[PDB]
């Protein structure tokens, strides 16, 4: 439901605003702790909901953007996804990324009527060279 | 009488001209070389005795224009000759208009100390209560019986 959507986005707005300069791994660790709570409570449902996936992509981009400006840069070439996703041990932030995906985009007009079913995807986040990244939702068994 | 016609078209004239001289100055002062687009022998000295001509000298456009201009600060004598007689037209009133002295729980800007009481209902209940508690009471004792 939309209430709990805007709560989620409320939260992430909260990490961002509420951190004076919190270093990095603290930020990321807050990210994980939040998101995991969400994907963990609503397991199945998140599949269906467009705007939530939208918010995921945004939010996560926004956090990485934090660590980035933490230096000075948005430049994408400086921060290949290794930097953000290698586990703490190897010296990365270890943030657990389920932004990526590809996001079902089908023809809004009718999707205000029929439920037209997925015909297309819109690239959620990106890379430069790609590889891919595994996403949480796939490691959590669904409620049913 | 409100003042005619070929009067207001005079005062209007001599003013409007005077303003155009002002504006045209201040445009042709400054440094937009392109604000200027928006717009005499003059000495008989002594009796003119020697005649004269008054010739502006073209600058060197690089050098500052207005060699003497600057931003300084002056104070002026407000000097006048004439006076302006100001000509206008404590018993019951000081009752009314006496104002106490401020003593504020919050600020104490000098540190002053003050007798506390400068720092520091009538109605009863509504019988809504009386009825409430006694009704609860009655139903109560009915029930217990």
């Amino acid at each position: 439901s939309e209430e709990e959507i805007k709560k989620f986005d409320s939260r992430i707005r909260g990490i961002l605003m509420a951190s004076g300069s919190t270093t990095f791994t603290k930020v990321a660790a807050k990210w994980n702790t939040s998101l995991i709570s969400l994907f963990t409570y609503f397991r199945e449902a998140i599949v269906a909901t467009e705007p939530l996936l939208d918010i995921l992509v945004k939010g996560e981009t926004r956090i990485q953007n934090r660590v980035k400006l933490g230096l000075n840069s948005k430049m994408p070439t400086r921060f290949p996804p290794a930097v953000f996703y290698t586990p703490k041990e190897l010296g990365g932030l270890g943030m657990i990324s389920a932004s990526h995906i590809l996001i079902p985009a089908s023809d809004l007009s009718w999707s205000k009527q029929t439920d037209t079913g997925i015909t297309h995807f819109r690239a959620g986040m990106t890379h430069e060279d790609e590889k891919l990244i595994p996403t949480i939702f796939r490691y959590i068994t669904t409620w049913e | 009488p409100l003042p005619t016609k070929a009067e207001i078209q005079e005062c209007t004239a001599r003013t409007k001209s005077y303003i155009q001289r002002l504006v045209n100055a201040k445009l042709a002062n400054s440094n937009n070389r392109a604000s200027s687009r928006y717009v005499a022998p003059a000495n008989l000295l002594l009796n003119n005795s020697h005649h004269i001509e008054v010739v502006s000298k073209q600058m060197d456009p690089l050098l500052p224009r207005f060699v003497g201009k600057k931003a300084r600060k002056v104070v002026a004598p407000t000097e006048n000759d004439e006076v302006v007689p100001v000509l206008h037209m404590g018993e019951a009133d000081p009752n009314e208009w006496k104002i106490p002295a401020a003593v504020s729980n919050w600020k104490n800007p000098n540190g002053y100390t003050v007798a506390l009481e400068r720092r520091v209902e009538n109605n009863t209940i509504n019988d809504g209560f009386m009825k409430l508690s006694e009704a609860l009471e009655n139903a109560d004792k009915k029930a217990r019986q």
Binding site: - | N31, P64, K69, W97, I99, A102, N123
Partner: protein, 145 residues
């Protein structure tokens, strides 16, 4: 750009330089003109001349009245001319609605999350909680009367 830099290297910076109201320095201004515009009225209810000390001290009554209004203190000054007290209540109502009105407007700027600054958030939580409590105590009192 450079044209300026060099007229300032010759002719010095300007002394007056007014400035403008703006985002940051707003309230101070709003305040400042409010106070001035009490001091007219209260200077003209007084019979004659007596001003300076009477004035300042009456403004101290202003602030004290406001910060009472916030804390919801009923604020009765022991003895003081009725009309004056009228004026203070009039204004402080005005400032009150400036405040509450801005509290709504901003909250509904945050709920969208559209470029509200940092402190603006924390502040606006202040203005809210205050307002919420006032509603509270009201609701109780009327639950008495």
């Amino acid at each position: 750009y450079i044209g300026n830099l060099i007229t300032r290297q010759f002719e010095g910076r300007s002394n007056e330089i007014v400035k403008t109201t703006t985002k940051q320095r707003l309230d101070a201004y709003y305040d400042l003109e409010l106070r001035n515009s009490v001091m007219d009225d209260i200077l003209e209810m007084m019979p004659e001349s007596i001003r300076q000390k009477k004035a300042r001290t009456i403004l101290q009554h202003l602030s004290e009245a406001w910060r009472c209004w916030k804390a919801n203190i009923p604020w009765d000054v022991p003895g003081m001319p009725a009309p004056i007290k009228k004026i203070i209540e009039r204004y402080i109502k005005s400032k009150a609605d400036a405040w509450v009105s801005a509290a709504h407007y901003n909250r509904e700027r945050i709920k969208r999350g559209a470029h509200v600054e940092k402190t603006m958030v924390k502040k606006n939580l202040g203005r809210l909680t205050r307002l919420w409590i006032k509603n509270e105590q009201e609701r109780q009192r009327q639950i008495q009367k």
